[PDB]
Write a protein that binds this ligand. Structure first.
Ligand SMILES: *[C@@H]1O[C@H](CO)[C@@H](O[C@@H]2O[C@H](CO)[C@@H](O)[C@H](O)[C@H]2NC(C)=O)[C@H](O)[C@H]1NC(C)=O
Ligand SMILES: *[C@@H]1O[C@H](CO)[C@@H](O)[C@H](O)[C@H]1NC(C)=O
Ligand code: NA
Length: 205
């Protein structure tokens, strides 16, 4: 038998719920090599040119699948069929689903407090991409204080979601600080308590 990758599946419909979508499709021929699994890909209005995997290796017996959707986003999906020869061209993309705003569901990862020079303290974190913003006017709220009884938190709003640090200067060398980096948007601060990270001014811990 002469084999080839499968034909593009036909996306037949979609159901858009508040926090999930059910995508439906019909395979269109396996060109003589049984379909092994499907991949459901998705793109958003934030990064429309990027197609990322919503789910890989979806069973060959499924003709529909439920995928989770994050708050404040528009999503369109497409399906690719795979057989031993390889991947089929993608199906046409689905109609879009729009999700409503909510508070952020996480705070930034990799929070570090460390000086780069003797008398400063640099607080850094990994920026959260737009799909994690969850509502308009997303910003980071950075707080810090010396680990001294009665010391008050000093705070700073960072409205640039791509910014990954703040530099605090005129600090004593090698002293301890308690630090927090919280995600906040129009709906409120995130629903997960941020970890109080221990940091040190100067270059040593
Ligand atoms: C996901 O990517 C597709 C393109 O691969 C987007 O579809 C294009 O959208 C523009 C309008 O923004 C149309 O003018 C083009 O004709 C589109 N056509 C398709 C046929 O490719 C789609 O809008 C993107 N999804 C989201 C949510 O941005
Ligand atoms: C969704 O698409 C509409 C229409 O293009 C746009 O006005 C809106 O900004 C988009 N929303 C998000 C969260 O990307
Ligand atoms: Na989101």
């Amino acid at each position: 038998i002469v084999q080839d990758v499968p034909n593009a599946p036909k996306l037949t419909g979609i159901t858009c719920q508040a926090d999930k979508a059910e995508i439906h499709w019909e395979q269109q021929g396996d060109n003589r090599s049984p379909i092994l699994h499907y991949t459901i890909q998705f793109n958003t209005s934030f990064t429309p040119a990027s197609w990322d995997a919503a789910y890989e290796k979806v069973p060959n017996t499924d003709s529909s699948f439920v995928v989770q959707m994050s708050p404040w986003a528009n999503y369109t999906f497409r399906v690719i069929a795979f057989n031993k020869i390889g991947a089929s061209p993608p199906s046409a993309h689905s109609d879009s689903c729009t999700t409503q705003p909510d508070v952020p569901f996480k705070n930034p990862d990799n929070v570090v407090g460390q000086g780069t020079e003797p008398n400063n303290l640099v607080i850094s974190w990994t920026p959260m991409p737009e799909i994690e913003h969850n509502a308009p006017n997303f910003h980071y709220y950075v707080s810090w204080k010396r680990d001294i009884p009665a010391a008050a938190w000093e705070n700073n709003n960072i409205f640039d979601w791509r910014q990954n640090n703040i530099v605090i200067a005129d600090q004593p060398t090698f002293v301890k600080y308690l630090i927090k980096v919280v995600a906040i948007n129009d709906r409120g601060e995130s629903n997960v308590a941020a970890e109080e990270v221990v940091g040190y001014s100067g270059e040593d811990r």
